[PDB]
């Protein structure tokens, strides 16, 4: 999961190519949910990347900690929020028992689980890691709503060279038994003579299939929002799944 080059050599570049509004709205949603859980709030960010959300959460008074399977992400996150709040650790290793009030997994981290069996294992570990009444926020990929185009992002190079850096990206459902998606990334920095291609296999990229899996993992309540706006799921390619553990 954390071994893909996108999250290692290109970890900092991953951040630069993520639209700012995407970060601001989803992070605000998380902080809103933390408030609705009371004070203090113990939060685990599963796949925290460079730790932007952990910073916002900790600045808001949340007892936020994170895990990521990428060594380069952990290093970047620890530089932002210190060493004790971030751990190199796979979501498949989660073994806490009731330690958190809110578990968050944004930006499709959960689909790096190995198939449905892997997803169910991780969701059950997340379920066990939450207190009774605790909640989870999982951002998923609904592959059937993926853009039907190869997308492109251009940004200036290390010394301001215009369009020196390009990413092309393609998301398509795979013809598999279980709903899954091939997420293809191409990275190029022309001035530095860098060219990377990489094909991420993402498992259970279907909002209805994911919700049913969340139920099977033990969550009493499961809600799918179209976005941080909290509208009902309709056409979003990256809806938000909110789950609650029974009392
Ligand atoms: N099995 C796994 N366990 C923990 N983290 C994983 C993982 N597989 C992939 N990841 C991590 O999940 C991230 C997916 S992209 C991260 C962006 C996301 N918006 C965020 O919260 O930061 C990467 O940092 C990658 O290293």
Author numbering: -1 to 245
Question: How does the study describe this entry?
Answer:
Crocagins (1 and 2)24 are very small, intriguing RiPPs that possess a tetracyclic ring system, which consists of a pyrroloindoline fused to a tetrahydropyrimidinone moiety. Here we use in vitro experiments to demonstrate that three proteins, CgnB, CgnC and CgnE, are sufficient for the production of the hallmark tetracyclic crocagin core from the precursor peptide CgnA. We further show that the hydrolase CgnD liberates the crocagin core scaffold, which is subsequently N-methylated by CgnL. The crystal structures of the homologues CgnB and CgnE reveal them to be the founding members of a peptide-binding protein family and allow us to rationalize their distinct functions.
